[PDB]
Amino acid sequence: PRWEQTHLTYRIENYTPDLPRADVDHAIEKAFQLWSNVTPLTFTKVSEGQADIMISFVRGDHRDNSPFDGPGGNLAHAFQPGPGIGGDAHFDEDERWTNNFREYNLHRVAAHELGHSLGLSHSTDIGALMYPSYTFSGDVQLAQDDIDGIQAIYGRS
């Protein structure tokens, strides 16, 4: 399935103590801009009511069929675009998140999780952010394969 609406809303359930909210909001807001900058889609944060995309951080087992197994395993995951828990996105909080080319990068994982909510499947292109495993690349930018793909679904800005 896909979102038939041209506008989407998202909301953060809570911010992790690892980093403040101003820094995390920037990372999450920046990712939406990268997708909106190449697509007529629009995003808006809501402080009340249900949001199309819910973002929250979890640890160890959190009432899910895919509990995290220590720092190894998946670093994050999300549910297919659907009602109820569908569209929700969980982030592994057992690892330390940073705001720069440090060990891990939150904005980068945020950009990938959003791609899954947009209905984008994984790709085999090295320059594609939708890399199957977690790999360190260079700058965070959308690849032509991702731009052509999302644009093909909706259209060009």
Ligand X SMILES: COc1ccc(S(=O)(=O)N(Cc2cccnc2)[C@@H](C(=O)NO)C(C)C)cc1
Binding-site entries for Ca(2+) = 18, 52, 69-70, 72, 74, 84, 86, 88, 92-93, 95
78 neighbors 116 (Cβ within 8 angstroms):
yes
Task: Give strand pairing partners of 122.
Answer: none
* Bridge pairing between strands 76-78 and 89-92: antiparallel
- Hey, is 72 helix, strand or coil? strand
Per-residue x/- track, 77-96, Ca ion (CB under 5 A): ---------------x----
Quick one: which of 79, 104, 131, 154 contacts ligand X (CB under 6 A)?
Answer: 131
**C-alpha distances out from residue 125 to 49, 52, 59, 132, 144, Å:** 38, 29, 31, 10, 10
Stretch of 36-44, 46-54, 55-63, 127-135 lying at the interface with ligand X (CB under 6 A): 127-135
The CB-of-70 to Ca ion minimum distance in angstroms stands at 7
C-beta of 40 vs 71, nearer to ligand X: 71
**E-assigned strand segments in the chain:** 7-12, 42-45, 53-58, 76-78, 89-92
Per-residue x/- track, 87-126, ligand X (CB under 6 A): ---------------------xx--x--------------
C-beta of 48 vs 103, nearer to ligand X: 103
CA–CA separation, 30 and 10 (whole Å)? 13
- Cβ-closest residue to ligand X? 112
Active site residue 4: no
Give the catalytic positions in this structure. Answer: 113
